[PDB]
């Protein structure tokens, strides 16, 4: 009945954006609120007297909640793989995150090259997307899941930054993007600026 | 029916660990093998990695043998402090790697953002063991073998920590899955290597 999400006050957040898309897909009212900079980071979510961060058990606690909107996919199998690559995008890519923050998608693109390890992890993650997405896939797992979301925002990591992309994944991502709870995000993204800063 | 985990050579794997424990409390019989990322559980024709995916996996098939809390809210954040610390924590892992567990400890004083990581896993540590508490969350779950871990980082590499928490690391270490993790990785010497 009381919903909020507290993200960064910059709306940088790749988590908090994906929260943000589970509450819009599950169609559950809340509200938004913005921090600067047993939680350690945003997002939040308060949920009447409890209060829970970490995305993944932010949407986990979603699915139980009201568990006839899934955004998993409904095979038991296929879920434990989206988990997985989830799990994978959150952990993993560690040089591909530190050298293509989310600022290349909202603000400028970098100038600086992939490092060696910086390709390392773009070239895995063009691997595991590829196979993935096998059979000109619209979406990973047959219709659309939260997975969707987190892979095109990584992808854009690299789109958006100039960095090269293969035509078939550029494709995917920016059908992702058009997903209209994402277009709610950048939206709110600059109404959010202009009302927070005064 | 079949389940194989795999696991890296040396098992000093956190992950593989975390999962080994789950398989053991739930009591499902499984093979092992190491492989020189893992854990990947493979279960009949399905292959799974990511040990949070894992346990998850697990609990939708024995959903009667929770590594889990009942409660909701309970569940919620026992997901949370898993998920913070595979992320979080990350001057912590870094100069106390798994090596000074299993094998030797580090003389390494530790970095100035590594005494911070230390300070947070206390302190989030300290809230969640309020009173007197013997599990994280009541009865024992997953993610109290997964705090006994990063606190045995500590522990075994000597540095500074409260008695409170040695005896709550202790006592988790202790645990028969646990146990039996410690014996395997000299069993797969003699084995292993040949």
Known sequence: EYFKLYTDSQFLSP???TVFVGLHEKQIPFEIAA??????????????DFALSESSAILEYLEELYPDTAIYPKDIQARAR???IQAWLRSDLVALRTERPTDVIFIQPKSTPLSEEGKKAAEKLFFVAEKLLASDAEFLFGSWSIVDA????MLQRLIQNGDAVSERLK??????WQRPSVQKWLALRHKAENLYFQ
């Open 15 to 17: 988590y908090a954006f």
């Open 35 to 48: 921090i600067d900079l047993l939680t350690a980071k945003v997002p939040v979510l308060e949920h009447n």
């Open 82 to 84: 989206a988990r997985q």
């Open 150 to 153: 987190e892979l095109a925002l």
């Open 171 to 176: 494709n995917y991502a920016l059908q992702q």
